[PDB]
Design a protein around this nucleic acid. Structure first.
Lengths: 187, 78, 104, 190
RNA sequence: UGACUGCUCCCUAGCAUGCUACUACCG
RNA sequence: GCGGUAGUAGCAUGCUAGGGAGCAG
């Protein structure tokens, strides 16, 4: 704390008294010098701690306000944060069935109900283009979620039944394409 | 380490599903809660994975909900 | 000990608070002025006044905590989910409450 | 802190003493200066301390009385709210059936559990499944508590209207099953 | 929508007590 | 020459009050 007038006064008094004492002198001069020195020393010493307490208190207050602002900010982005985190962990898991269904949904082939686990029960998906049908459906079997399923019904956007033999490269582009395959889980 | 990862992922997935107002359909919410509670009690890492597939199918079969493609282009899921 | 054994014969709708009608500035209320315990028998209140002027703060507090008015100003309810005795429904809808997962 | 009653005397004495010191007079005037200034500062000390104590005492008293006033205001508003709630719930007592069953009592006291059972106008039923449904409220009118009730509305756990034509054995697994049935007292109260 | 107890850690404000220090009064 | 008293500053000790959090039945 060397930026206060009290420090300047105390330093000048210290220098004057020290020089006078080192020069050598009587008792009355020493007494007068110390009576004029100690008041300035106390004046300096009070502020020397008051300033420190003020500075640390200000630092703590700024810390607390930063923490409050950050918490208020954080509690307002939870949906996006959670979605990003979930997909990061889904990457890190690295499973074949999960990767299969995520890529299928990313290209457009999403399911319509909860995927069953038993050797029975119906599953319905939507196939929006011929390329997805070429990749997944070949023959009369269906490969989805790293499993095997058996096609039993095909329905178009007009809800008319389409037989499996109908679908072909050039024979397809005269149809309502968002097909709906309903299959059951092969053993 | 392959089991705690799937349990944490299941917790995060259930949180994400709850954020999308899924508990406004009692049957779907009951099924999701049952699956989530069953994953955390698993002991082997195959039943947990099939239940995880079943639970993720719920989120995937909601058209508007989220953007699968944007969330896959952010140096995220492949 | 004897009352516990003997109370299993009598109908279960004759147990609980006993209510009656009192008048406050000419308007009728319904308040509880006793109890019928399965163990302690019949108990009657000692300071009950039928006709009274406008009531104070502690009387309001006592009358707002009694289940008598709430039960008497509600609809009948028959609940088949549980086997415990049911009294009344305070609203026109049934509330279903869920529990959310944790944060990671 | 600058216009205290002793401030004038203290400052005037200090100024006069320091002027005498600056006059370069003998040591007796210096001793008198020192004594007078010492006693002046000593008397200024308590005048500067007691006032500061008193101000803080007064401030504490003001704060306490303000919070007391706020508490009284809150009490008044809660009293008004409770009175309003009681007088509002009073207006649904159905004061003819209640009077009819009160007068039959031998001293005016009746159990509380039989008031909704004999004077209520509406009935609500919660049904777990279809097997329980077909044994309790089958059809359009049923009997319960020695009275006749007729159905008015049926909703599901999601609070959506459900028609009785689709509550069947085949269509049972397609409903949010905690069904709620609402009926009215027939021939009696509503 | 958030019960009754018990224990412990952290931060601030006040009170009481003690230690040291600086001036001043008194004998 | 020693002690007493009156303010002022720093430090330590125990309570009361307010706020945040953890565990147990």
């Amino acid at each position: 704390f060397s930026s206060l007038p009290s420090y300047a006064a105390f330093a000048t008094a210290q220098e004057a008294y020290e020089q006078a004492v080192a020069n050598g002198d009587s008792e009355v001069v020493l007494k007068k010098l110390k009576k004029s020195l100690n008041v300035a020393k106390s004046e300096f010493d009070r502020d020397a701690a008051m300033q420190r307490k003020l500075e640390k208190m200000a630092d703590q207050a700024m810390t607390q306000m930063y923490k409050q602002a950050r918490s208020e900010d954080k509690r307002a982005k939870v949906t996006s944060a959670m979605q990003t985190m979930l997909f990061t962990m889904l990457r890190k898991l690295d499973n074949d069935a999960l990767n299969n269904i995520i890529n299928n949904a990313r290209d457009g082939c999403v399911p319509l109900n909860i995927i069953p686990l038993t050797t029975a029960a119906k599953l319905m998906v939507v196939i929006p283009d011929y390329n997805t049908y070429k990749n997944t459906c070949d023959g009369t079997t269906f490969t989805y979620a790293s499993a095997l399923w058996e096609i039993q019904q095909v329905v178009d956007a007009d809800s008319k039944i389409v037989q499996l033999s109908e679908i072909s490269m050039d024979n397809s582009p005269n149809l309502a394409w968002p097909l709906i395959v309903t299959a059951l889980r092969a053993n | 380490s392959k089991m705690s990862d799937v349990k944490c992922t299941s917790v995060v997935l259930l949180s994400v599903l709850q954020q999308l107002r899924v508990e406004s359909s009692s049957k779907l919410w009951a099924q999701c809660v049952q699956l989530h509670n069953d994953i955390l009690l698993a002991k082997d890492t195959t039943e947990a994975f099939e239940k995880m597939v079943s639970l993720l199918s719920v989120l995937l079969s909601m058209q508007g909900a989220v953007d699968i493609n944007k969330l896959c282009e952010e140096m995220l899921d492949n | 000990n004897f009352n516990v054994l003997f109370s299993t014969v009598f109908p279960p709708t004759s147990f609980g608070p006993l209510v009656r009608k009192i008048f406050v500035d000419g308007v009728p209320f319904v308040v509880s002025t006793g109890y019928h315990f399965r163990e302690l028998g019949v108990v009657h209140n000692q300071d009950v006044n039928l006709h009274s002027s406008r009531l104070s703060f502690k009387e309001l507090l006592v009358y707002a905590a009694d289940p008598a008015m709430h039960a008497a100003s509600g609809n009948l309810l028959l609940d088949k989910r549980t086997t415990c005795f049911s009294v009344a429904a305070l609203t026109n809808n049934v509330a279903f409450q869920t529990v959310k997962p944790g944060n990671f």
